[PDB]
Design a binder for these strands. Structure first.
Ligand SMILES: [Mg+2]
Ligand SMILES: [Mg+2]
Ligand SMILES: [Mg+2]
Ligand SMILES: [Mg+2]
Ligand SMILES: [Mg+2]
Ligand SMILES: [Mg+2]
Ligand SMILES: [Mg+2]
Ligand SMILES: [Mg+2]
Ligand SMILES: [Mg+2]
Ligand SMILES: [Mg+2]
Ligand SMILES: [Mg+2]
Ligand SMILES: [Mg+2]
Ligand SMILES: [Mg+2]
Ligand SMILES: [Mg+2]
Ligand SMILES: [Mg+2]
Ligand SMILES: [Mg+2]
Ligand SMILES: [Mg+2]
Ligand SMILES: [Mg+2]
Ligand SMILES: [Mg+2]
Ligand SMILES: [Mg+2]
Ligand SMILES: [Zn+2]
Lengths: 106, 69
RNA sequence: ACCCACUCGGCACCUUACGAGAAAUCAAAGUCUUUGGGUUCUGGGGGGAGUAUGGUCGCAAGGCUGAAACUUAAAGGAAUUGACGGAAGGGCACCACCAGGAGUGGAGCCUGCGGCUUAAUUUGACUCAACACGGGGAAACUCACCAGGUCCAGACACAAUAAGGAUUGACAGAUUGAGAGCUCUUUCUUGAUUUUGUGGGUGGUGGUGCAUGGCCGUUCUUAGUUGGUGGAGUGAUUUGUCUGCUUAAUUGCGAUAACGAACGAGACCUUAACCUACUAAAUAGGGUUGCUGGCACUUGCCGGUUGACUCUUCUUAGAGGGACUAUCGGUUUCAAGCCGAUGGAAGUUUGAGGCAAUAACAGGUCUGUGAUGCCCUUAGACGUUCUGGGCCGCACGCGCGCUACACUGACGGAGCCAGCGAGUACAACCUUGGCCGAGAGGUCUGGGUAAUCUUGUGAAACUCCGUCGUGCUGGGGAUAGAGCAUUGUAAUUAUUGCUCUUCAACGAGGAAUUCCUAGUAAGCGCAAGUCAUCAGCUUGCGUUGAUUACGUCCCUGCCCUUUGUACACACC
């Protein structure tokens, strides 16, 4: 939870933390702690999602900690500045046009 | 795993057999120090060849001398 | 007799409950914690049990009446999301089927897996989702197995010797498979490293994948999944996420107590297609032109040369562009879309992939790991290291494959075209060209760390003219016998390559059943992967190139909807 909070603070679009192993009792289970956006499929995965896998050794067995972070597309530096599907249109400007000919002269 | 049978022999190594140490020397009439056993021709006095029945091997050379004397 | 309107009484029914209720539901099951209209009967957890007994009524069967001991943490009710159904509907899919193709299953052989056999024939995996899989093509190594030997890679801690030696080393033969001092003959060296015990470890292709990680495989590459408000429920929940029509798709159009969103799909990215438009090149290809070789012999045709000059169409690869189902015609709530032309390089998601949700499986790996818990083991070690063997044995089952059963051929000539690749200096890589050899191979020389050399990988299938013409025949190639080569320290249990000989089974394969819709199926090679050596395997690649649907739920599997459930460890 703390980790997730930290990630959020850091200003990331999403965090996903999978903790796999024996967490109380012998029969082992992967617990899943998540927040925010996240993508999963496509080439924007290797672009924005940063991953980490570290196995933690304890005196009853091994844990495995898998952490994902979805970085903000706008805050990119090098590469594409958005998700490929996201289309945002600019707003038009106000018009009072007609009012009969006339010429500006120099 | 298979039942361990083992066909005898519980061997060991040479545990040296420490004999006398300075038996390859003689000292006689006060001051004299006479040598027993032929000294090694490969490396001089201090190392002396082992004398057997026409067997003349070494220790620093470990084995390398065999010629008759 | 109808028709209309009203009215008492009845059998019901429909919609709302503002009332009830655990809810299903109920105009009573309402007017009940805001509790009292009058009354009769019945129940007080489940079993024991409507039993025992005693009455009583019956001709009898039986009825009415009706216990207790003991036993037990639940029995039940209504609903819920699942799971399942030898329930009913609707989808989807060549791992479904039609329309067809190519077949496997038959045969000989390679090779997996049984079973047997064995000193050992090491194991892991058994419907899809074990079975040419562990990149598992094992001569040793590998190596986990067996017959034997060798070594300490017994940290460090504490002690007994503490040099009159702790202890290391050891040719010659018997010793021993053995130029293993393995030791036993020996008596020369070695210098406090150690060895002898006790704490303690470390290594283990030992064990458990039912203690785990990571990775992967599978539900599923199917279309599925979720939360924020709002609505419906006392609630678990539900609606959104749906009757339809669409799509490859919960893809959309729509309908609508939901509205707007997110993940998945799509978008994306890699690649394959087009570019006489750019930017370029003696590590790509051309043009003219030098010299030059052969021709007809007029100028003309094919050549050899990195001699000049220039070019970029083919080439490579940078930056762009280009297709968005465009234009038109039908068809459909005139919607989403689908169908037909036309133009175009491209009109099946433009072709093929890469990635791929929520939830899971006691799926597979502890034989990839100095990923790993715990247990075993731990110096006659399950650590190792040598040596030989074994993994490959055969009465026999099955699983991928290869070769074929010929005339659309076979064999000889000759013609003669690819695309992916790969490739050494501390080694021994790829290896043209010259000589030797029927081969296999040698050899000398090279060129290449590579768009430069192998290599235009002049690969097969193919096409051209010939010999046999349908006979287990020159189809076909299994076993065999002998020789000559090659790799490696080692080829018997043919490693493999070649030479002559031998010529077996099979005239297209039953019960079955796999794969497939376009540059695909199938045919044919080549290529890297392992590799010192070995291809019938594998990832790619080109070459030749069809037949037949362009559909449907009949089968098979999956999904959803409606239903039933006494299941929810979920029909094992
Ligand atoms: Mg997505
Ligand atoms: Mg995608
Ligand atoms: Mg034994
Ligand atoms: Mg009772
Ligand atoms: Mg019930
Ligand atoms: Mg399947
Ligand atoms: Mg094997
Ligand atoms: Mg192979
Ligand atoms: Mg290991
Ligand atoms: Mg498992
Ligand atoms: Mg709500
Ligand atoms: Mg729902
Ligand atoms: Mg139209
Ligand atoms: Mg696609
Ligand atoms: Mg299991
Ligand atoms: Mg282990
Ligand atoms: Mg296979
Ligand atoms: Mg080439
Ligand atoms: Mg014959
Ligand atoms: Mg082999
Ligand atoms: Zn000496």
């Amino acid at each position: 939870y703390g980790v997730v909070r930290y990630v959020m603070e850091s200003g990331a679009k999403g965090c996903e933390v999978v903790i796999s192993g024996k967490l109380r009792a012998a029969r082992a289970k992967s617990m899943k702690f998540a927040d925010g956006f996240l993508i999963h499929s496509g080439q924007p995965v290797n672009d924005f999602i940063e991953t980490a896998t570290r196995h933690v050794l304890l005196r009853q067995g091994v844990l495995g900690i898998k952490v994902k972070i979805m970085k903000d597309p706008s805050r990119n530096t090098s590469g594409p500045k958005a998700l490929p599907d996201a289309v945002t249109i600019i707003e038009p400007k106000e018009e009072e046009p007609v009012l009969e000919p006339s010429v500006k002269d120099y | 795993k298979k039942v361990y049978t083992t066909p005898k022999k519980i061997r060991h190594k040479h545990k040296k057999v420490k004999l006398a140490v300075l038996n390859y020397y003689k000292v006689d009439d006060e001051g004299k120090v006479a040598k027993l056993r032929k000294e090694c021709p490969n490396c001089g006095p201090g190392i002396f060849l082992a004398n057997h029945g026409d067997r003349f091997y070494c220790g620093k050379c470990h084995s390398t001398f065999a010629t008759q004397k």
